[PDB]
Amino acid sequence: MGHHHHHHSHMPKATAQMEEKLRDFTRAYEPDSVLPLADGVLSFIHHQIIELARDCLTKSRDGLITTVYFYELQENLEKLLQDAYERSESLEVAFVTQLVKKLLIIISRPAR
């Protein structure tokens, strides 16, 4: 992220790279806004995009992320992926899918 005198972490660390990708990703928007998509169900799933993003971000910085954390988080994103694919009216779903997918790519092991 730099600052004035940047020459600090001269170790290519996945902490720096990923946490920056993740924070800049999540920073741009709100849980309740940039479409509630479908009011109720996909409003919940939009909350899930932004709140799993913010929580996993702060838990990465905290170091709380275990190996278990990732398995639960991935299968929860893919749960909500199929919940968004169960959302019969798909226009809003392009955002949802590309967001949880891009997030899954940011935290390594890129999706499809």
Query: Could you give the C-alpha distances from 4 to 7, 15, 106, in angstroms and in order?
Result: 9, 21, 26
Query: How many beta carbons lie within 10 A of that of residue 5, not counting itself?
Result: 6
Breaks (C-N over 2.5 A) in the chain follow: none
Instruction: Provide the CA 10 distance to its chain's centre, in angstroms.
Output: 26
Domain assignments of the chain as residue spans, ordered by start: 14-108
18: nearest Cα among 103, 100, 76: 103
Across 56-95, the runs of DSSP E, i.e. the strands, are none
Which experimental approach was used here?
Answer: NMR
Domain 14-108: CATH superfamily is: MAST3 pre-PK domain-like (1.20.1480.20)
DSSP element (H, E) containing 72? helix 67-86
